[PDB]
């Protein structure tokens, strides 16, 4: 029935930290804490809204509690259970919601230097997991720049034939009358002559598509590697919250009694 | 082409258009003339010459290694400069203005991308912006070439000033009876061997005035008319300038002397002015006339939103490339949300989940919201999150406005190629990421079709918002201590519901404290046509605010176009080109928030740095080094192209740098990738092998600093040059100056160019630093901190200004002894400072030492900057003690801490050798300048936290969030009284040291 016994009072708690308690939940989600102000009597309601978190001050004077000048509640315990009920339209209508959800503070189901010892181990779990994160990430970028750059080389590469195979048709065009009078003359050397360099340009343009097609290779088959770390790090990104969520839990379960102990542990 | 550098003669094959090809062995250094010449030569030799003009009638082509077909106009170019993918060249006839496709190559080389790349755009926003806004090229350029020359003076050397001539009473005290002395020279032989002439003249003297000084005490002796001394006054004023020796900074404008950056500096450290007297027409003729050629790509039925009678609505079609585990997640889904900045404007709604192996939804998505209601910024983020208690995280976001730079809502089907989720954010959505779509191939694309309401939607002109303001709005004395109070809160201040409708029921009377309206904005219903209607209203005629005031309406919590305007002509209006220069990271930054490429702040900015060149080199710096970023890099390249081809002839010179920085990081690539596996004394001797290159030598020597391009960056001193031994081994590099009078101001210009690790972290605490120390000063405490110069130029590569005459402390430790077992002597520093400043200079030295540590304690705790040891602690000779290396800030990973402890080696120098250190008068008087210097913070901890805010579009992961910015708030204390805050800063310094405060 009393304040620090209620399951939706948190005490001190940052207003970072109900952000973070209250992100992607539902309308009438709500918390109350000490106001930031850390000034006794004083309290702020935080209830989420059509996406956001709407912040609400628990005013006090003489022993009671409201939104308003009409304090009118003797306890802030009783204001909260009668808009648990009835719609905060009452204070007012832009708000429409009542409290539906309270973000109760206790829910996760040995001596103290079991649960520390069972500390120790997740946070290694933890800290070993977010460097094999770290490592795939910097092979994630050393992979990107490696690949776009590739992609250039190329763009490169067409260009190249692409002037490589004009060539070939301004050879063809322009060769073409002078081969066919050489050839009535009968000037066989200066065909040949025509021949050589022709066989020459279309012996370097298929040098050069060679290594147009090595590099093609070359890369889809690492722009492959490239998707498959990216699996990998996106099955590792949600493992690694949830071993970091363990960890802070302990942590704060281990602080009540051992503020010493992880002084030392880690 | 993956070629270090090319042999001396190389086989380069050309295509004649005869259809022959031909291969030429030609030096490496040739030029293309050369080439061109010689090919033509040889070219008799193979069938069909007779089809060949003469070689005046052609130009060569080939594929440079971005994968452009370059016309080679500027034929004076170097076969080895050309940056070929591989050794050809095709023989073609030049077509097009050759001033163009030259100018257009060097500025492809300054941007860091061809030019040619931003022709082939299908975004009209893209085509109309590189058109619209050359009209900010012409009139800064009118404006500067309008009182030639000495207009264009004022823009390549302009006037380094202080924001105010008024000297605060703390620096004026050091004046003689409020004058100052200084040292005036002149160049009399063409050996170039100098005269003197010292005068003491009033600190409020302009140059003129000094001129008319000098003039007098050498015509003192000539027995002048009192008006023949005022003609040669009048000539000399006319005739000759002054210059700061050593440094190519000038005095060209009539502010008071003492207001001048440099010599408000010699009276700060009583140092002696040196000026040397230079005839105006040898400045002018140094400043080569330059053009703005106007290019050539600047040529060549609706409803109203308000009429739209539904609900928003959003189709889901499919995605495409969705690179996730099938078997170890269960389903994808799609988030969505409408945004209006970071506030989501309703609820967020999402897909079905749906198999990993099929991504297709189509699914229609109703938002809580009424077409009319949405706010022109009105935005769509989303993303592709992943599932497998129940958790969630994001695969790849995307955003999107509602309305596009032309005022149209969105219609249609539309395809979104997403981007990669930032490192270390969780979030599900990216609503302060940029909008757009991921240029890069095999993106996970998403797509999309928005309602078309039988015709193209408009947003409606501002002359019907007006309309239905009025149509809406027809539907004392504790209130007025109420908006003082909640004007006087932090940017960041929790501000309740009843404190928001409190102030939008006032907003009339807000008008009388102007400063309140960003917390006035922020209580606005943005998802209600009616609010925001009216609050256009007030904003057209708000009285302006300061501008360290409205740079906070253009972070990322301010996105409407009429709050941002009136936030941009603010600054226009108020912000001095100084403080304009020394917020030009965060005003650069704030460019990304932006929606679209065209709008009041980037024509701005664009503005000023094209009639102020100190600003628009940093200008231009800070956007070239984030031209690697995809996400900004056609925004910041199309902004680049429009800089550098209206700067004039600093372009010439930005080459030589960017083209110098070019070949300190080729190099330094090799040293850390191809050369890894050898020592740093055998690293040495391969480093001198490539400086001794000539073309080394030329790009390296003679230009200007990337750091202050006054100063001038002359031969190196290849002896002092050296890899540094540290981990990512960085390049100490030692050039000497070329003025001719740097024997005045420093002859060893040294700095460390650094390749590795991101710099923006210290540019940002660098920068805070010296804002910090700034009101230090101008309150009474002589802190004296020392900001080096630090300049990120790429990604994770920049440069670090060395400080002379200084050592870390832990370097000083060692030319101690030991005392302890296996222990440095604690009095080794002081006995260092003892040796460097014996007899009556000692006093002064542990005063700087101890004014100094204590700015940086101050500095430091409320950074959250990094701990602090003794290889990151420096002190100079002179005795101020400084740190480098400012790595994290704000607590960065994983409890209020304290980075910087003053160990007993600090103590017994502020204790001058005693034994009960913290109980001395001397250590009293220190606690005593650092509770004073945080107080004096935390009057001032709007303007820092608007700073961070400002930054955190960035990709600093240091500050992603808004709640980042929070550790501030809490060393502050701003949610506490200041006697609860002195209390608190107390508590954290006692506990650190285990006492005494």
Request: neutral net charge; hydrophobic residues 35%; contains cysteine.
């Given at each position: 029935?009393?304040?620090?016994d ?45 996406g956001?978190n ?18 009118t ?17 009452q ?27 069972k ?17 795939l ?43 066919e ?22 012996s ?63 | ?19 022959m ?114 009209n ?11 009182n ?20 605060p ?57 009192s ?39 010699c ?76 506030e ?169 404290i ?5 917390k ?41 176009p ?35 490429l ?47 081809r ?12 960017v ?8 190099l ?9 596996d050898?020592t ?68 060893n ?11 923006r ?47 870390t ?67 100079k ?21 304290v ?22 008068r ?59 805050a ?7 310094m ?8």
């Amino acid at each position: 029935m009393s304040l620090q016994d209620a399951e939706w009072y948190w005490g001190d708690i940052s207003r970072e930290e109900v952000n973070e308690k209250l992100r992607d939940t539902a309308d009438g989600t709500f918390l109350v804490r000490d106001a930031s102000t850390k000034m006794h009597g004083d309290y702020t309601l935080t209830l989420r809204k059509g996406g956001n978190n709407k912040l609400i001050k628990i005013f006090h004077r003489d022993g009671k509690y409201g939104f308003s000048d009409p304090l009118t509640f003797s306890s802030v315990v009783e204001l909260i259970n009668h808009y648990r009920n009835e719609s905060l339209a009452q204070y007012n209508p832009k708000l429409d919601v009542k409290l539906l959800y309270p973000v109760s503070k206790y829910q996760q189901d040995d001596n103290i230097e079991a649960v520390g010892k069972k500390l120790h181990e997740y946070n290694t779990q933890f800290q070993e997991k977010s460097r094999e994160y770290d490592r795939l990430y910097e092979e994630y970028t050393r992979t990107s720049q490696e690949i776009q750059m590739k992609r250039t080389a190329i763009e490169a590469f067409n260009e190249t034939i692409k002037i490589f195979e004009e060539q070939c048709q301004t050879q063809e065009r322009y060769s073409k009358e002078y081969i066919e009078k050489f050839k009535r003359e009968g000037n066989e050397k200066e065909i040949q002559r025509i021949m050589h360099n022709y066989d020459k340009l279309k012996s370097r343009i298929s040098e050069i598509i060679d290594s147009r097609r090595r590099l093609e290779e070359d890369l889809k088959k690492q722009a492959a590697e490239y998707r498959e770390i990216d699996k990998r790090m996106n099955s590792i990104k949600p493992d690694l919250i949830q071993l970091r969520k363990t960890r802070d839990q302990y942590l704060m379960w281990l602080t009540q009694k051992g503020v010493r102990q992880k002084k030392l542990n880690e | 082409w993956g070629i270090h550098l090319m042999p001396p003669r190389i086989l380069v094959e050309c295509l004649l258009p005869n259809g022959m090809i031909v291969t030429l062995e030609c030096l490496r250094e040739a030029t293309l003339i050369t080439i061109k010449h010689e090919l033509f030569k040889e070219a008799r030799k193979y069938p069909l010459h007779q089809l060949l003009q003469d070689e005046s009638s052609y130009i060569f082509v080939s594929v440079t290694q971005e994968a452009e077909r370059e016309e080679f106009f500027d034929e004076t170019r170097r076969l080895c400069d050309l940056r070929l993918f591989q050794p050809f060249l095709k023989v073609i006839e030049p077509v097009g203005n050759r001033e163009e496709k030259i100018l257009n190559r060097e500025i492809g080389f300054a941007i860091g991308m061809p030019v040619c790349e931003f022709d082939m755009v299908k975004d009209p926003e893209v085509q109309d912006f590189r058109r619209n806004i050359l009209n900010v090229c012409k009139e800064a350029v009118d404006l500067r070439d309008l009182n030639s020359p000495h207009s264009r003076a004022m823009y390549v050397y302009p006037p380094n000033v202080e924001s105010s001539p008024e000297l605060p009473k703390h620096i004026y005290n050091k004046l003689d009876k409020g004058q100052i002395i200084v040292v005036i020279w002149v160049i009399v032989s063409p050996n170039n061997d100098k005269q003197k002439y010292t005068l003491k003249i009033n600190h409020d003297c302009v140059p003129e005035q000094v001129i008319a000084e000098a003039i007098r005490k050498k015509t003192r002796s000539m027995l002048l008319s009192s008006e023949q001394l005022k003609l040669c006054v009048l000539e000399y004023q006319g005739k000759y300038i002054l210059k700061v020796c050593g440094c190519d900074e000038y005095f060209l404008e009539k502010y008071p002397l003492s207001q001048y950056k440099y010599i408000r500096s010699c009276i700060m450290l009583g140092r002696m002015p040196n000026l040397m007297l230079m005839a105006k027409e040898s400045l002018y003729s140094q400043l080569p006339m330059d053009c703005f050629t106007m290019p050539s790509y600047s040529r060549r039925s609706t409803k109203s939103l308000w009429v739209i009678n539904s609900a928003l609505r959003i189709k889901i079609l499919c995605a495409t490339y969705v690179n996730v585990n099938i078997r170890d997640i269960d389903k994808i889904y799609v988030r969505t949300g409408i945004y209006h900045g970071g506030e989501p404007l309703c609820d967020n709604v999402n897909t079905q989940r749906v198999p990993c192996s099929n991504p297709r939804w189509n699914e229609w998505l109703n938002y809580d919201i009424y077409i009319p209601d949405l706010p022109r910024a009105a935005r769509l983020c989303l993303s592709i999150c992943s599932v497998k208690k129940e958790e969630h995280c994001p695969l790849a976001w995307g955003n999107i406005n509602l309305f596009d730079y032309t005022d149209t809502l969105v219609s249609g089907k539309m395809a979104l190629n997403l981007w990669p989720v930032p490192h270390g954010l969780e979030d599900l959505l990216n609503p302060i990421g940029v909008t757009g779509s991921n240029p890069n191939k095999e993106t996970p694309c998403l797509e999309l079709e928005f309602d078309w309401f039988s015709s193209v939607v408009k947003f409606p002109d501002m002359s019907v918002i007006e309309e239905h303001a009025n149509w809406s709005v027809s539907r004392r004395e504790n209130d007025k201590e109420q908006l003082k109070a909640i004007s006087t809160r932090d940017p960041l201040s929790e501000i309740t519901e009843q404190e928001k409708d409190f102030l939008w029921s006032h907003r009339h009377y807000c008008v009388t404290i102007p400063e309140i309206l960003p917390k006035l904005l922020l209580s606005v219903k943005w998802n209600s046509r009616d609010e925001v209607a009216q609050m256009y209203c007030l904003v057209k005629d708000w009285p302006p605010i300061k501008p360290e005031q409205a740079m906070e309406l253009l972070d990322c919590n301010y996105p409407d176009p009429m709050v941002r305007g009136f936030a941009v002509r603010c600054l226009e209006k108020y912000l001095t080109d100084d403080k304009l220069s020394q917020y030009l990271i965060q005003l650069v930054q704030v460019l990304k928030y932006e929606q679209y490429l065209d709008n009041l702040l980037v024509r701005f900015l664009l503005k000023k740095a094209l009639t102020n060149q100190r600003i628009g080199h940093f200008f231009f710096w800070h956007l070239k080094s984030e031209m690697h970023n995809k996400t900004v890099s056609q925004r910041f390249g199309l902004l680049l192209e429009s800089y550098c081809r209206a700067c004039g002839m600093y372009l010439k010179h930005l080459n030589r740098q960017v083209e110098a920085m070019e070949k300190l990081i080729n190099l330094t690539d090799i040293l850390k990738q191809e050369k890894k596996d050898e020592t740093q004394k055998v690293q040495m001797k391969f480093l001198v092998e490539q400086m001794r290159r000539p073309d080394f030598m030329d790009a390296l020597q003679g230009f200007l600093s990337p750091l202050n391009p006054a100063h001038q960056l002359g031969n190196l001193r290849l002896e002092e040059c050296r890899i540094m031994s540290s981990a990512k081994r960085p390049l100490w590099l030692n050039w000497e100056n070329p003025d001719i009078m740097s024997e005045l101001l420093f002859q060893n210009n040294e700095i460390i160019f650094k390749n590795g690790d991101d710099l923006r972290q210290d540019m940002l605490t660098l920068q805070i630093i010296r804002i910090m120390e700034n009101i230090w000063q101008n309150q009474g405490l002589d802190l004296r901190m020392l900001p080096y110069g630090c300049l990120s130029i790429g990604d994770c590569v920049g440069l670090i200004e060395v400080v002379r005459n200084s050592h870390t402390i832990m370097q000083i430790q060692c030319k101690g002894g030991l005392k302890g077992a296996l222990q440095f002597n604690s009095h080794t520093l002081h006995q260092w400072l003892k040796d460097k400043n014996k007899g009556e200079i000692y006093d002064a030295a542990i005063d700087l030492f101890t004014r100094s540590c204590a700015g940086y304690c101050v500095a430091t705790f409320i950074l959250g900057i990094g701990d602090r040891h003794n290889s990151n602690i420096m002190v100079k000779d002179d005795g101020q003690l400084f740190h480098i290396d400012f790595g994290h800030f704000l607590d960065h990973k994983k409890r209020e801490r304290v980075p910087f402890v003053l160990t007993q080696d600090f103590l017994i120098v502020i204790s001058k050798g005693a034994q009960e250190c913290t109980k001395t008068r001397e250590f009293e008087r220190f606690q005593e300048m650092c509770y004073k210097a945080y107080l004096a913070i935390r009057q001032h901890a709007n303007l820092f936290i608007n700073l961070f805010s400002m930054m955190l579009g960035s990709g600093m992961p240091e500050l992603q969030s808004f709640d980042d910015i929070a550790y501030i708030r809490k060393t502050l204390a701003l949610d506490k009284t200041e006697q609860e805050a002195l209390e608190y800063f107390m508590k954290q310094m006692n506990d650190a040291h285990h006492g005494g405060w």
